[PDB]
Amino acid sequence: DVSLTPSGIKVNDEITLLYPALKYAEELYLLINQNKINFIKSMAWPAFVNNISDSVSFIEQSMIDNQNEKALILFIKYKTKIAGVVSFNIIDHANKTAYIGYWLGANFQGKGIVTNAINKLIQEYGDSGVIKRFVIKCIVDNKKSNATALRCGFTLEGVLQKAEILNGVSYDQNIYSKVI
Ligand SMILES: CC(C)(COP(=O)(O)OP(=O)(O)OC[C@H]1O[C@@H](n2cnc3c(N)ncnc32)[C@H](O)[C@@H]1OP(=O)(O)O)[C@@H](O)C(=O)NCCC(=O)NCCS
Numbered sequence: 001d002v003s004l005t006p007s008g009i010k011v012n013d014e015i016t017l018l019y020p021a022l023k024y025a026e027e028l029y030l031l032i033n034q035n036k037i038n039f040i041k042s043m044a045w046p047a048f049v050n051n052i053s054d055s056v057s058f059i060e061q062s063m064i065d066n067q068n069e070k071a072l073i074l075f076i077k078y079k080t081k082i083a084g085v086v087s088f089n090i091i092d093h094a095n096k097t098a099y100i101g102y103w104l105g106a107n108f109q110g111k112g113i114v115t116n117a118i119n120k121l122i123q124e125y126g127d128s129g130v131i132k133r134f135v136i137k138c139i140v141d142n143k144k145s146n147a148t149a150l151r152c153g154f155t156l157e158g159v160l161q162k163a164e165i166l167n168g169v170s171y172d173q174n175i176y177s178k179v180i
Pocket residue numbers: 039042043102103104105108109110111112113114115116137138139142144145147148151
């Protein structure tokens with residue numbers, strides 16, 4: 001499979017999902033910083049990304065989790081730029097289940113980048129038999145994330161009451177799955 005390269009997973013001509021590395025810390029940090037105000041509306045961690053050292057620490061932990069298959073954290077490269085992150089936040093091997101996370105900088109939204117990334121990951125891990133069940137959880141009022149889940153052919157399974165806390169406030173999540 002020529003799409004599986006040493007540096008990452010080639011999705012298409014414009015998108016590669018990069019294995020984390022320290023060389024990305026500066027660009028990743030700058031991207032998060034640029035999007036902090038908007039990102040704080042949908043995720044709990046951006047509020048606390050205050051220096052490049054925070055992105056270094058995130059990269060170091062992500063590499064440890066990747067090594068041990070606890071998670072799969074990938075940095076989305078679109079053309080020449082880091083565009084965001086796509087992940088299996090959790091890989092449950094015993095139950096062949098992966099829980100998916102994602103974000104894109106504002107300048108990279110509206111381009112199908114995360115939908116293409118997710119489709120590629122499901123082909124690679126799902127059609128190979130490693131993962132049987134893929135899961136997306138997202139706050140009910142997160143319009144774009146819900147649209148992405150549906151665009152990727154996931155099915156709504158239910159609503160998880162008060163399941164995600166942002167800034168001390170609990171929000172309901174939709175839980176979506178795609179089963180192989
Ligand atoms: C959720 C998030 C990743 C969605 O980004 P996105 O760009 O809409 O993601 P997709 O890859 O699904 O792209 C779909 C959009 O691209 C358009 N598009 C353009 N080219 C496309 C292609 N090749 N394929 C599919 N869609 C394409 C679609 O029309 C759609 O745009 P629209 O919203 O104007 O209808 C983004 O809003 C984000 O990062 N938000 C903040 C963080 C966050 O909420 N994360 C998830 C927490 S649950």
